[PDB]
Every structure is written in structure tokens, then in C-alpha cells.
Design a protein around this ligand. Structure first.
Ligand code: FAD
Ligand code: FAD
Lengths: 484, 480
């Protein structure tokens, strides 16, 4: 074999999973047909949960200073995204090229091999390994790994070759974007309803803006080619009366509300993640972000599989955990698409939702969906609010400096038993090779003595104040496998 | 110039007749005109809202009806709800056809001295700023009638609204439902409404041998201004269910659309609007007639106080400012429900989202509040106590009485829960506000509640007479 894992696609999903696999000491090869990274950026940010999953690995610092957007919308209804702890509408002004730039740098630094101008054309799972035919410039070759991951986009070669179904809804509309320098346009970050449709203006840097247009009168073009700048500028003008034709065009692109999901995330030793497993209309943080969550869910599970300590069922929890969460992103984006872009027909449902966001528990629910901070995985019985949820980022007073954080302690990408009493640290000794013990004092941890976290950050087990390792052995064995 | 009465109401529908009752309770001379020779035989509505029950019970109008049964559960655009989440709440009154409502309202109104004149069509209106002249077409030729105020309670196509020049903005119809009342078929009942391939079907009970068949198909769109024929409906019911009702007795055929419009102004000078003349929307449950009844109960005491020369400056102008937004929320919520319930597969993501949101108590209560009329809160000025601007709940008093039993005269009431501070302050207001010394957890921590003649709380005393003179003057006018 050329590597224990081959990843098809060096977008954010593939490069993030490359990072997680190298943290696990899984030898990995990343393939991409593109000779060069895409120069233009589709996403301009990523979600609050995606901020936390970068920060969890110390990747967020590699951007430098990253600022967040406090306010946003759901289906055109304004919302303060600070109403859940750590919540925002997403990272501000981090273009997708910068994001892929950072994740490749981290993956190559950690030993992932990146090979560009390599198109996968055929895959073969025999049930002891996976083989891939790759078209280079030099000719054709055959690479081999224990597991193949398709992170290869909306038209996933791997998904098709694997025979997995991509069911959902058909495009009912398009939006067009033009990137234009020198127009000095007034921003419209959430978009803005106007007679005839909707306009967004997003910043790109001091002298360029992205204009985004939707028109009720348009009109699926039923083309595979982008609209022209002239066409986008005509749309912008009918919508706002503003003329961008004097500007310098930098890019033109488009997207639709085609909303699909892979019926299976895993067939044998073939796995799917990111846009290969789900497409939907992009809204602000939503699109790339769940691909990063997919990769962070998969990596440690695929690695425990390959290292032979995978408990019975662990790699099957990739599908049962991520399929329903990615489906909810698909659903919420479709609901917002109709609320926001459905014209006067849908005004009553916008006014109704506008009324309902007066209730805290409604603002928290909508912010939770969009940020990715509401994710709760099935980790068996127990009713502690923290159980099955993201571990939040908290200052930890311990030995270490004499100060650290909970997120600093996940850089290694290992399981972690935070001990806030020796009982838990003592039962964990079976699992030192897979779980780190951190003794430090941190409120979501209020009446708690210990928290066990899977390597993705999600709480597998707590100890209320008094209990020792009451449930810990069962917990350790479910997610990390047999004691040594 | 001699006037025929202080108020002429155009329309003897439930809105007109409720208004006539309220005006007579305020001793306003009232003529009600209707072009129809008798009340409509066929019943459009088969009930009314939890708040409409209360406003009938508020006047002792629920006694020749007997016992009013309620529906404990309902839906919001398909999504099931328990409507008892609010105290006093329900999906509305069970099995009371509109004909029975109109008979009861006509009874109380003519009893109380309102003059109801049938075969009288209003064809012309002139408001010269001192009164309003109405040209009436009768079988005995034409007459001119004159009043101080004219109220259009004259339905969806208000003669009065157009003659007053008042815009009726809103949405055009996008669909039609068809109904047919059929005796003898003994159909399976479909109370809530039931989605089937190609549309939706209701079958409601009318009595032992009669059932109402309601029909909508995504394929019919819009067609004309005539009703559909019984055959067009029976055909539709077979396309939707396969069942054949063509061997039953046709009793009635009709239809309604999702046309959703609201009068831009509830008042222009000496012309006011109420009920369907002020708002139409697709009828869902007790929604349609119910808001007209709340309109009448908001307006009556206000238009009386204006005519009798004691209105606070601005009192009658609160008819528009209170009722326009509230009736707005009915038009909005019912359109919302029409797109959730009947919007098809493209609306499934929104059905799923609202499915998720209703698991929160406060969104259940919000939706149940909207639909029942129990959420209504009027601007009554400063104060954060939860009762202010809301309906007074029906409570037991102490030999013993009810808060509602005290509202039958349709006057303001000072509910004094031992003190004589409030009742002394109200001495100047005794001609319009009645003092009830009686003891009644919604009133907990209160020594007194002041209530407008419509049942809405204008002021409360925490444990004396602190601002009662301000509240009395605002709602009931200058002291004697
Ligand atoms: C116009 C537009 C605007 C968008 N806006 C947003 C936004 O605002 N926010 C947001 O979160 N998301 C947005 N998205 C979506 C977002 O870009 C995606 O969710 C994200 O790119 C997913 O990354 P991925 O790595 O999963 O897939 P991709 O980034 O598509 O990566 C797939 C990679 O696989 C490679 N590949 C494919 N097939 C093969 C093969 N056979 N052999 C080798 N290599 C192969 C391709 O070269 C490509 O590099 C937008 C998309 C569009 C089109
Ligand atoms: C098929 C159907 C089903 C419905 N189902 C329900 C339901 O289930 N629940 C619900 O709450 N509501 C329902 N509604 C609506 C409900 O019937 C109305 O909201 C209610 O009748 C309005 O009362 P109103 O007094 O405001 O108007 P109307 O009842 O329309 O009364 C208006 C009156 O004015 C008279 N008039 C009009 N113009 C003139 C004129 N120029 N001169 C003299 N008289 C005039 C007419 O004769 C008429 O009697 C339904 C309506 C329809 C059509």
C-alpha cells in the first residue's frame, strides 16, 4: 500500500481530515486533479463550531487574528447570535482559499502527502484494502490504501463509483455573484429584500465587494456556465438602480438551492465527507462548516478502525451521528431559502417567525442550528445537559504556565479525561495510549468532578460531584476500545 | 336636521348584531339595515373562538344557547396543538352553526331596543361632517335615512368601505376550497382536515343524517364568481377519496378562497368599519366571524362615549389603533397556516422547523394565543403587571358572584378586592363605572382592577388609588 488512507479531494474537508489522520499517526495521501488550489473563494467565513474545531487543534491561531460577526438572520429574521455561549454568525473575512491554504500547510507540516494534478477515475474495495486508478500528466498509476475517503465535492467521483445514492430536491432557483473592485458599494451582509428579489453586498477587502442577486422573474438558465458580469450588473441594476459596469470585474459565479445528501456515508472501506455527502444552498457560515465537522467526526474513528482498538460499531457511528446532523443543515437552509426568497407569498411566514424570535428558547434554537453549537450525539443513558455535547472552551488552573484551556488540551487530537479524587484518573490507566488525563480546576461544569471527551471534543461521560469512575470503564470501552 | 337614529349599522350579520347589542347597552339609538329579507338559512361558520365564547358570556348571551361545548385540541397549519395550554383556551365552540349565532344575536339586540330593518339595501352614503345620509332601496321605493355615525358591518364587499373611499389592500386569491352539505351518505368524518394524493378533504358532522364535505385540489387553481355545481364537487371528492356522494341529498354548495385583505382605515370621520367589511382571510377554525365580534365589542362603548359628548379626546381613534393590528395578526396567521398546511413538498422543510419549534411551551402558547384571541394586549400606558391591557379572566367572587356576571350591563367596572381609596376616587365616574366590592392565581397581589366596558384591564392597584383618576379620565372621560 502507498498509505493507510487515501483522501480524494484537497478542499477544506479533505485537508482537515488529513490533519486529523496525521494527528492519529495514520499515513495519508491527499489527491486532487487541480494543478493549483482554486484562486477564487466560495465561502467568505465558517461557523462558530468550525472556529472551535480549528482552535481545538491550534489551527485557528495560524490565520492570525480571527474576528466574529455578532448579528445575523434566519430566513431574513434578524437574530443576535451571541445568545448561546461561544455563538456568532461566523468567522469574519476568512476567504475559503485562506482556509484551504491554512489546512494544507498544517497537513503537510504533520506528514500528510499532497499530490496535485491527480484525477481519480476508478476505485476498487476488495474487502482487505482499496485501490484507485489515478490519471497524472506522466501517464496512469494505481495507488492502494486500507481505506478510501471521497472528499471530492458535489459531483463526487467516489460517491458514484461506490454506487451510493444522492437523493434530494432539484434546483428551483439560482443566485449570481459578481466580484467587482472600485465601486465603493454600501454593504448588505444578510441580504436585503427589494421589489423583484434580494441583493447582498459583502466586503472582499478595502476596494472590492461581492454582489449577490436573486430575481423572482429569473429563471433557471439551465446552463452549466456562469452568467456573465454584464448579466449580473443588469440584475443588480434592476434590483437597486445602482450601476457597477464602471467597476473592475474580478469574478462571476452562481449557486442554486439543490439540496441533496448521500444515502450512506460508508460502504465497506469507502467513506464520504463534506460536499460529497451533502449539498444545499450556502448561507453565511453554512456549507463548508459541516464538512469540517464531518472530517473531525471521522478521522479518530477511521484511525481506531485501522489501529485495531475500534470498539464494535465505532466507525458505523460516523453515519448515524453525521447523517442526521448534515440533514438538519440541509433542512434549515431550505426553510430559510423559502422564508427569505419566497416573495410576498412567504411574507406571512416571515412575520410569524419574526414574532416567535421574541422568545429566548426560539432564538437559542435557531442560533444553535446554524452555529453547530446545538449538536448532541447519542452517548447512551444519562441526562446531564453536557452529555453528548461540545465541551466548551474554559480557562483551566493546573500545573502545565499555571493556566491553560480545555481547547488547548485537544491540540494532540487524543481523548481527554479532565479531572477537576483519583478514581477516574485511576480507571483511565488502561487507556493512557488513547486518553490523556488532565488534572486542573475550571458554569457548564458547575456540580461536576470529571468530564471524559472523545477526540472530536464531544462529552462521552461526566462524573457528578461525589461519583468516582462510576460509569467511566463502560464509557472508555464504548468510544476508545479495550483496556491494555 | 332630524336624524332617524344616533347610529345606522349597514349589515345584520353577527358583527352588525353584536354591535347593535353593545350600542343599546350604552343607550345609543340604533337602526340596523340588511338587504336580505331574512337571515341567511345556511351556516358558513360552525363555531367561534375561545375569546368570542367569553365575550358572549361577558353579556350573559350564553343561556338560550344552553351549554357551549369546546374542542380541546386543534392544529396550526397542520401542526397539532393542545389549545388548553392557555387558561380558558380551546380550538373554539363545538357544532354551533352561524345561523344559531345570528338568531341569538338578533334576539338580544331587538330585545334591547335596536331596530332591525330587512329588504333595505344601502346604495349611497354622504358624510358632511355633522352626520351621515344613507340612500336605502326597499320594495316600497327609496328613502333617505340620517344618523350621527354610520358603521359598515356589511361584509367582504362592503358598500360602506367603497363609498367611504377606504382601501382594502392585501393578497389576491391563489386557491379555492369547495364545500357541499349532503344528507344520507353516512361518510367517515375527517374533522381536522386530511391530506390525500392531489389535495385535501374535510368531512364535518352537521347532525344525525347531514355532513359537510370540504374539498381542495392542487390542480383546480382558480376558475369565476359563481359557486361550483354539486356535480363539480362530487367529482372532486371522488378524485380525492374515490367515495361517491352523488346518491345523497344536496342541501347546499359553496366555496371560499385564501383572499386576505384588510381595510387601511377603520374610521374615516363619521364612518367606521367592522367584521368582514374590515378584514377577510381564509376561514380556519373559529377564525373569521370571531374577530368581527371582538371588533363590535371594542367599538360599541367607544362610539357611544363619543356620541354622548363625554369621550376622552382620542377614545374613538383607539378603535383603529387597537383592532387594525389585532385583525392584522388573524389575516397573517391564517395565510401562514394555508401555506404550511397546503403548500406541498417545497414547504416540508418549514413544516419540520415549526415541528421543532412547537416543542417549546412559549411557542405553543404564542400560536394558541393568536388563534383563540386570548393573547390580545391593548396599549393602556405605563405598567409591567401581566394583567394590564389584557382581558379580565372569569373568576369567582365573594354572597358570591363572577367577574363576568358583573360585565352584563356593559359598563366599566372597578373591582375593589376592604379599602375605600379606589371607590372614593371613582365617585366622579359613577355614571359610567360601577364599583364592585368583592374578594377573589391571576389577581394575587392586587387590591383592585379597573376594567373597560369590553372586559380589558385599563389599570390595577398593587397592595391604593395610585393613578386611577388618570385611568378613568383616559378611558371614560371628565369627572362629573
Ligand atoms: C458560489 C458558491 C458560494 C458558496 N458560498 C458558501 C458560503 O458562503 N459558505 C459556505 O459555508 N459554503 C459556501 N459554499 C459551499 C462550500 O464552498 C462547500 O461546502 C465547500 O467547498 C466544501 O468543501 P469540500 O472540501 O467538502 O468540497 P470541495 O471544496 O468542492 O473539494 C472537492 C475537491 O475534490 C477535487 N476532486 C473532485 N473529483 C476529483 C477526482 N476524481 N480526482 C481528484 N480530485 C478530485 C476537486 O478538484 C476539489 O478540489 C459555496 C459554494 C458556491 C459554489
Ligand atoms: C364558505 C365559508 C365558510 C366559512 N367558515 C367559517 C368558519 O368556519 N369560521 C369562521 O369563524 N368564519 C367562517 N367564515 C366567515 C364568516 O362567515 C364571516 O367571518 C362572518 O359572517 C362575518 O360576519 P359579518 O357580520 O362581518 O359579515 P357578513 O356575515 O357577510 O354580514 C354582512 C351582511 O351585510 C349585508 N349587506 C351587504 N351589503 C349591504 C348593503 N349595501 N345594504 C344592506 N345590507 C348589506 C348582507 O346582507 C349581509 O347579511 C366562512 C365564510 C364562508 C364564505
Amino acid at each position: 500500500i502507498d498509505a493507510e488512507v487515501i483522501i480524494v479531494g484537497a478542499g477544506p474537508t479533505g485537508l482537515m481530515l488529513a490533519g486529523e489522520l496525521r494527528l492519529n499517526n495514520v499515513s495519508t495521501i491527499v489527491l486532487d486533479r487541480l494543478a493549483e488550489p482554486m484562486q477564487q473563494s466560495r465561502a467568505l467565513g465558517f461557523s462558530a463550531r468550525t472556529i472551535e474545531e480549528f482552535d481545538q487543534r491550534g489551527l485557528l491561531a495560524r490565520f492570525g487574528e480571527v474576528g466574529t460577526i455578532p448579528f445575523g438572520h434566519f430566513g431574513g429574521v434578524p437574530l443576535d447570535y451571541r445568545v448561546i455561549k461561544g455563538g456568532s454568525y461566523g468567522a469574519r473575512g476568512i476567504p475559503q482559499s485562506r482556509t484551504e491554504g491554512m489546512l494544507a500547510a498544517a497537513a503537510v507540516e504533520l506528514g500528510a502527502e499532497l499530490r496535485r494534478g491527480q484525477e481519480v477515475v476508478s476505485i476498487d474495495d476488495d474487502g482487505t484494502g482499496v485501490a484507485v486508478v489515478v490519471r497524472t500528466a506522466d501517464g496512469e498509476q494505481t495507488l492502494r490504501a486500507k481505506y478510501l475517503v471521497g472528499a471530492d465535492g458535489a459531483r463526487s467521483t467516489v460517491r458514484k463509483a461506490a454506487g451510493i445514492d444522492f437523493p434530494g430536491t432539484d434546483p428551483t432557483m439560482e443566485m449570481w455573484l459578481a466580484d467587482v473592485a472600485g465601486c465603493d458599494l454600501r454593504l448588505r451582509f444578510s441580504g436585503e429584500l427589494v421589489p423583484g428579489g434580494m441583493v447582498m453586498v459583502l466586503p472582499l477587502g478595502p476596494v472590492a465587494q461581492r454582489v449577490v442577486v436573486f430575481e423572482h422573474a429569473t429563471g433557471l438558465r439551465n446552463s452549466t456556465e456562469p452568467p456573465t458580469f454584464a448579466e449580473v450588473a443588469d440584475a443588480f441594476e434592476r434590483l437597486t438602480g445602482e450601476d457597477i459596469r464602471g467597476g473592475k470585474p474580478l469574478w462571476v459565479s452562481w449557486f442554486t438551492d439543490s439540496s441533496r445528501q448521500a444515502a450512506e456515508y460508508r460502504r465497506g472501506r469507502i467513506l464520504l465527507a463534506g460536499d460529497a455527502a451533502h449539498i444545499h444552498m450556502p448561507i453565511g457560515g453554512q456549507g463548508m462548516s459541516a464538512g469540517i465537522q464531518d472530517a473531525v467526526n471521522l478521522g479518530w474513528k477511521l484511525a481506531a478502525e485501522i489501529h485495531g482498538h475500534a470498539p464494535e460499531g465505532l466507525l458505523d457511528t460516523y453515519h448515524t451521528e453525521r447523517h442526521p446532523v448534515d440533514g438538519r443543515v440541509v433542512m434549515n437552509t431550505l426553510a430559510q431559502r423559502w422564508l427569505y426568497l419566497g416573495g410576498e407569498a412567504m411574507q406571512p411566514l416571515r412575520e410569524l417567525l419574526g414574532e416567535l424570535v421574541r422568545y429566548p428558547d426560539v432564538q437559542e434554537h435557531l442560533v444553535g442550528m446554524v452555529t453547530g453549537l446545538d449538536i448532541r450525539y447519542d452517548v447512551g443513558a444519562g441526562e446531564h445537559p453536557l452529555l453528548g455535547r461540545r465541551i466548551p472552551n474554559q480557562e483551566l488552573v493546573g500545573e502545565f504556565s499555571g493556566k491553560s484551556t480545555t481547547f488547548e488540551q485537544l491540540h494532540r487530537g487524543r481523548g481527554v479525561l479532565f479531572a477537576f479524587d483519583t478514581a477516574g484518573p485511576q480507571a483511565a490507566t488502561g487507556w493512557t495510549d488513547r486518553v490523556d488525563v488532565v488534572r486542573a480546576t475550571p458554569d457548564p461544569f458547575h456540580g461536576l468532578d470529571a468530564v471524559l471527551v472523545r477526540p472530536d471534543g464531544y462529552v462521552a461521560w461526566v462524573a457528578p460531584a461525589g461519583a468516582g469512575a462510576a460509569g467511566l470503564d463502560e464509557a472508555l470501552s464504548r468510544w476508545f476500545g479495550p483496556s491494555r
